[PDB]
């Protein structure tokens, strides 16, 4: 039979209708820093001003200084008509948890 599931269309909730929190979870901040540190290990191209000798410190400082070039997508629902309703959050405009 039709094993292949049909393609989905990405439905982005307008920014004034988002229901999830404006504060990053510790999981999300850790994921952002890990992903960005791996990207820097790939390229090394950053807009951070101060010099750091490791990708991890550059990633944390980019998150803390609100310069991280990543977006958080929170998948809210998969409609059985084909839509994938998600929320897009900008970590540069979000609260940052206690990463100590």
């Amino acid at each position: 039979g039709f094993v292949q599931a049909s393609s989905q269309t990405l439905v982005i909730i307008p920014d004034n209708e988002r229901i999830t929190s404006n504060v990053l979870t510790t999981f999300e901040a850790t994921r952002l820093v890990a992903v960005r540190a791996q990207q820097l290990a790939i390229n090394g191209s950053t807009m951070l001003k101060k010099k750091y000798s490791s990708p991890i410190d550059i990633a944390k400082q980019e998150l803390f200084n609100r310069k991280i070039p990543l977006l958080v997508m929170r998948c809210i629902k998969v409609t059985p008509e084909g839509q994938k309703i998600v929320e897009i959050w900008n970590p540069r405009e979000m609260g940052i948890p206690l990463l100590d």
Partner: protein
Amino acid sequence: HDIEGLKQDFRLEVGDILYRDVVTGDVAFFNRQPSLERSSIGVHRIVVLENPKISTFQMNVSACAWYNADFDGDQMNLWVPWSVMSRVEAELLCSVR
């Protein structure tokens, strides 16, 4: 390439991966079995013991409460994250604080 089989004209180039020794300040996961609570695996900062006659994992007695451990002959596992992603997760999520 191994470091003892390394060429005369060899040098580090941007994009190479250097596998270096574990130094003081590195993070490591510390585990005692059976792993019954979620503090049974915790991330500690490594202090390397330069004395060549020491084969034991050493820790503060107040850290034993995380692992239900004591010093009658318990053995514990230790692995050091080498991946960047796992190193970030170790110090931001799994640190014993």
